[PDB]
């Protein structure tokens, strides 16, 4: 029944709204000026960064920004975990599998959602109260510059797909419910849940994007792209935590990364 599939899409959309404060729609309203609110403070260099500390925040610059990125990631992992628990069937899974699904899925989700807050010139930060330029971020002394730029590369391509928050809610749920994550104990219930989510996604894209018949197939590909970009991200992280003497990695990130074979 399609009605069941549409009600599921709607349920996920409503949960998505409750879990993620700054949506792509709200992100775009800010980036376009549609909102009469105070525009976001623009951080384009070391100087502007210093000036906007009190507007984005409620050691050298490179490490300073890397640290900030970790804090956002920690916060996103909590929001993503909350959204995951709202996915029908998720909390009824074995606890150990819930953790595994999160361990391997959160960062692919972070990459996906970061796209909603970016354009070719920069990324919205601090719930849209700040905007840091891509040029400033990629100029950061290596290996930090190369740490940032990859997210933007993905976003520019992903954004060309023109998904909205409604499409994203299901896309994200499908990713979280991947039954091929290393170490899963009860794969069948996960795959059953994902197969239904996939049908919901396919219907969603067919109704919401009638003019783009290839969107479903392209998103399935993005899912595989995200794993590759994640592996590279993890590797890129390994080098930083062992070459940068003063690199405290947040406890949550350590947990996630530890033994991510």
């Amino acid at each position: 029944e399609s009605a069941d599939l549409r009600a599921l899409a709607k349920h996920l959309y409503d949960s998505y709204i409750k879990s993620f404060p700054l949506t792509k729609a709200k992100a775009r309203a800010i980036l376009t000026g549609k909102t009469t609110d105070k525009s976001p403070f623009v951080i384009y260099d070391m100087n502007s960064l210093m000036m906007g500390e009190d507007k984005i925040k409620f050691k050298e610059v490179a490490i300073r920004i890397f640290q900030g990125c970790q804090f956002r990631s920690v916060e996103a992992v909590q929001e993503i975990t909350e959204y995951a628990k709202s996915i029908p069937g998720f909390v009824n899974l074995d606890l150990n599998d819930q953790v595994t699904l999160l361990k391997y899925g959160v960062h692919e989700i972070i990459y996906t959602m970061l796209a909603s807050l970016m354009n070719k010139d920069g990324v919205l930060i601090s719930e849209g109260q700040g905007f840091m330029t891509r040029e400033f971020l990629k100029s950061l002394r290596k290996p930090f510059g190369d740490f940032m730029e990859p997210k933007f590369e993905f976003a520019v391509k992903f954004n060309a797909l023109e998904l909205d928050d409604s499409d994203l809610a299901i896309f994200i749920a499908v990713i979280i419910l991947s039954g091929d994550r290393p170490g899963l104990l009860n794969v069948k219930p996960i795959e059953d849940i994902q197969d239904n989510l996939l049908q919901a996604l396919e219907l969603q894209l067919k109704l919401n994007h009638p003019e783009s018949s290839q969107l479903f197939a392209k998103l399935l590909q993005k899912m595989t792209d995200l794993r590759q970009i994640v592996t590279e991200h993890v590797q890129l992280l390994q080098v930083i935590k062992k070459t940068e003497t003063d690199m405290s990695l947040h406890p949550l990130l350590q947990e996630i990364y530890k033994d991510l074979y």
């Binding site: 628990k85 606890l95 953790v99 949550l252 947990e255 996630i256 530890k258």
Partner: peptide
């Protein structure tokens, strides 16, 4: 391990 993720999940 994953004590934090466990906490968040049963939260």
């Amino acid at each position: 391990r994953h004590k934090i993720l466990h906490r968040l999940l049963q939260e």
